[PDB]
């Protein structure tokens, strides 16, 4: 019922760089967002939950944010095994919507 | 009931709440509808989901729990097997019933408590712009329109801007 | 950290019925969620059950064609689609729905292995 | 029912009272049934003073299934039975040790 | 104290209550006395009762609790019934004396909030009728017969009858 | 957060709180501080260490817990053991772990009722003389020297003779 | 299902005082109630005690005669009426108060099966 | 303190008939009523609790009603198995008075 | 690895079996190991009949 | 009714530390207050912890030259007092903070029996 | 911070008369008072905790009473085993402080 349009829609960068995934929502989501990064070939995994938690196990250089309609993941450096495609889901009220996709490749 | 909001001052449920728990129902102007409390409903059924998991997970696993066999010689060892596998059921049985009670009734009151608080945050969003009235409902002085229920829900809700409507509406006349 | 062990591997012709299994490490209460990986297109979620509530939601473009049930005596999710259609090649992923803080819902948490679903002559 | 056996054995304190009593040393008891198919050979020459007696004895039994048959072979040292039992099982019991009377209630 | 109400609040209980629980005392000009609430104290006896009743019956019984004596060369065997006896036992006493303790907290503030409940339902009911006043007391503002009592323990209030009397009595002058 | 003060609408903790647990700040004119509450805190002191102390005290103490050994042909008996010795410790470690998390939730809803008794312990010393705002603060209407937090913390906090000041603030002009 | 055994048959001469037991079956908390079965009137409560507050309420008319006790230790109530008259000749039936719904208080819920009490010459 | 007045004091009918029997009370004594039939030489038995709840293991012909001082007892239809006299109960204060019994024989 | 070894010795319920049978009476059986060195000396005259 | 076990008696040269136990009888979490009796002179309490608050208080008069630490594993309180000087020679007592309505907080409920400490040539 | 002025310094008595000991404090400590009697060359021991209540294993010949700055220790008789020195504490702020010591001797 709400689409997530992700934004960028794809960018390329280097080794420690300064990225950041928008997640566009038409209605309020609240804050119940998350963050998912998808390896080619490999099961997908979240990184933030709620917009603002960080998962265990996971390197401290993602720090997620926004509530309402504007969110943001700010990563502070890329390093060579964070590179894939990102999605953004809603689960304020269902049904729950993944996003497009953000790729990040070597430049 | 410790808390006294289900089955107290909320005299009874609605059949139509589907996707929520601690629902509303908005009888305004634009339409109507029975919109969950999505934050209260998904804390509370998190917490329920906590409880049930530890219930589970704690129990611990071995790989038997099956009282041997004797002969007729050894009378004292088949009676002792059967006092510690009776005994460790008698505690079991004891202790499960009277948690599956006691944690009934702590979820019973935990919903109590979540229709309480949210009965009082909405009071206290509110404070005197709606008069309250029995069940648990609400009576907005000002009009109202859809954004009151994003503005509640959102826990946004400004009094001053709604505040002299109110003011008008308390006497009318 | 519930080791997820999804069904193997299989193949079917259009027109049936698809059973992937979602057999968990052990018993839990927390929500389902499964999720389609179509080459070359990105995730959406199709459905999923609450052992809390009960009701089996769905996507609003595929209610009647699926159906999710998870027996909480095994806690194991079970997955059908009627109806099966060749764009619907795909690997499917099942989700847990258990994080660091307990188990929370409207999240993911821990998620499946995959099961290699497609459907062709 | 199934009916309880009881028995003994008697250990004399040396090898006169064998040999004056039961006229002959090297005497064995075997009692024998379904289950039950032990042998008991007594033939010990001394022992301490106990209530005053110096010789020693040792009471076994055993339990006679319905339908079942038990057999006592011996040719010495035996304690026959003289009042055998027939118990009927019941299960959950056991001995108080007090020294109250007995009452009703 | 959980709630607040017993020890709270209500500073001290009343010796004349012989009837049932949570009474009252209407030194009204008709008479005065001490008349029980007789929903809300049969209801809590009611959930008095279920709880012991469910300590007494969960418990299951058996014929045997007792252990067995064994001679001077099965000191494993004494020793390994001691310890079943003494863990039995030891896992009895501390779940019975924290049962015994934790329910004794439950039946303290579930009486905390019966008389908390009631004490909202009657302020519901009278909304700004009647002001407050320490102890849990209360001062009707209008004139307030025996028939006050019939509506107030029977719930049946209707505040708008007296509502204009209360609203002259707020100033007086 | 049952009774909903703690995390519920008294957003945030105090890093300035030393002395006491329930404190206050007093934000006059005479100056500032965090002043606890010494009546309150040293009561929910007391019956933290109560329940502490009777976690530890009730469990009985014995000389030994030890399994035995057995040699290569009393299976039976070394399993026997290891059956008592796991289930005692399959028991201990399902009842010690729903205590500690049950009565860690008693423990926070605790701490979440001393805070609500408090506020609705001032909210009724002071009934409307001082407006409720936000994050569970006051704002008092008359003019409020340090002799106020004398009275407040004692419970002396004589309504009349600030009643007229708050009566005149209500509107001021 | 609480089986309720009372006492036996049993007759006494005017002025003396009589004992009719309702021994349970298990141990229960809930109220006892007696009540007397006349041939040709109707039934009439005459005292009882509930286990919680511990007090023994009794009819305005029989109060002092009659006396009630049932030791929580037994839950086994008594049935005591001094000064017996020959109109009390009569069937006693005690009640244990207890429905499906848990034990209820003012109630009857099970009853007991009747003890012959006359008292003529 | 308060009397049970039964109302009508007795009438007969046959198998499978509308009756009621109206419990009558001078205070109200909100909906702690019982209802109980009373075979002739056995123990006496309840059938409605609390004025509308029903007892377990009870036929479902019985239906009580009513609060304060007018109650109510619709039999929907009558057995060969239930003909017996009739008692209603208060219970909203001590003392607990019984009824005057409404019998019911073959007509 | 751990092996199981089963064995078993008979009671004839005469003695003109253990006559007639192994040519000899008082026949023992000493099964030895390191940590088993329990003897055997069936001799008995007599049984019930139990399965024919 | 902890029976508290204090430590002997030492004395020890000026401008050194000291080491007085508490060893009590068994567990227990109350507060621990300790006590000064110099000879001729009323008491005066120095310093104390709280296993709750966890926080080690002291008299505005004494923090730094003395600290307070009882580890909740073995409830034992253990005194020290840094740069001894003479007119500290005295006898303490050692408080458990527990009377008969539980362990109360801001009472002494029982003592201990004290330990002579006397600073001196 | 709060210190407790002990009045009267220093009285004699004699075997069952009336003596009373107050405790006077700056600063209003509620009802957090304590009463101490310290018998020379012994363990002090405490006879009044709250002002009120009254330790296990007293005489009752001893009640305290007071609040605020005003506090008082009324002994109904004096026997000769309770003459010592009296100190009262305060507890309502920390820190702590005891008292001087009113002394009682045979007259």
Not at chain 1, 71 to 88: G, K, N, R, V
Not at chain 2, 22 to 49: F, L, M, R, V
Not at chain 3, 14 to 33: H, L, M
Request: proline letters at 3%; a neutral charge; hydrophobic letters at 30%.
């Amino acid at each position: 019922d709400i689409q997530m349009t992700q934004s960028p829609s794809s960018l390329s960068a280097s080794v420690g760089d300064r990225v950041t995934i928008t997640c566009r929502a038409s209605q309020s989501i609240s804050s119940y967002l998350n963050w998912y990064q998808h390896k080619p070939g490999k099961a997908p995994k979240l990184l933030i939950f709620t917009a603002s938690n960080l998962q265990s196990g996971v390197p401290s250089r993602f720090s997620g944010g926004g509530s309402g309609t504007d969110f943001t993941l700010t990563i502070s450096s890329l390093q060579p095994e964070d590179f894939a495609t990102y999605y953004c889901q809603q689960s304020y009220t269902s049904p729950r919507t993944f996003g497009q996709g953000t790729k990040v490749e070597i430049k | 009931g410790l808390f006294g909001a289900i089955a107290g001052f909320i005299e009874g449920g609605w059949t139509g709440m589907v996707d929520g728990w601690y629902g509303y129902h908005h009888q305004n102007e634009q339409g109507s509808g029975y919109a969950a409390d999505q934050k209260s409903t998904q804390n509370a059924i998190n917490g329920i989901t906590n409880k049930v998991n530890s219930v589970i997970e704690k129990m611990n696993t071995q790989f038997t729990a099956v009282g041997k066999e004797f002969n007729k010689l050894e009378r004292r060892m088949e009676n002792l097997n059967k006092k510690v596998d009776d005994g460790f059921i008698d505690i079991w049985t004891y202790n499960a019933e009277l948690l599956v009670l006691l944690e009934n009734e702590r979820t019973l009151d935990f919903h109590d408590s979540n229709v309480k608080n949210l009965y009082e945050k909405v009071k206290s969003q509110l404070k005197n712009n709606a008069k309250e009235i029995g069940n648990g409902c609400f009576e907005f002085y000002h009009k109202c329109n859809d954004e009151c229920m994003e503005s509640v829900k959102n826990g946004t809700y400004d009094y001053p801007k709604y505040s002299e409507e109110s003011k008008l509406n308390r006497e009318k006349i | 950290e519930v080791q997820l062990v999804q069904s193997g591997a299989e193949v079917k012709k259009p027109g049936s019925s698809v059973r992937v299994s979602c057999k968990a490490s052990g018993g839990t209460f927390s929500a389902i969620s499964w999720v389609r990986q179509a080459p070359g297109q990105g995730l959406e979620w199709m459905g999923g059950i609450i052992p809390v509530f009960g009701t089996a939601n769905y996507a609003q473009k595929f209610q009647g064609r699926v159906t999710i049930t998870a027996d909480d005596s095994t806690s194991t999710a079970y997955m059908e689609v009627s109806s099966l259609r060749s764009d619907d090649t795909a690997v499917y992923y099942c989700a847990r729905e258990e994080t660091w803080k307990g188990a929370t819902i409207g999240v993911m948490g821990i998620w499946g292995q995959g099961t290699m679903v497609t459907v062709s002559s | 029912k199934e009916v309880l056996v009881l028995w003994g054995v008697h250990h004399p304190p040396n090898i006169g009272d064998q040999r004056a009593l039961y006229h002959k040393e090297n005497a064995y008891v075997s009692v024998v049934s379904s289950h039950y198919s032990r042998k008991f050979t007594p033939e010990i020459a001394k022992r301490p003073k106990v209530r005053d007696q110096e010789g020693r004895i040792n009471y076994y039994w055993t339990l006679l299934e319905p339908g079942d048959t038990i057999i006592f072979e011996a040719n010495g040292n035996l304690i026959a039975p003289r009042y055998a039992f027939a118990l009927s099982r019941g299960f959950g019991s056991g001995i108080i040790n007090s020294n109250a009377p007995m009452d009703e209630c």
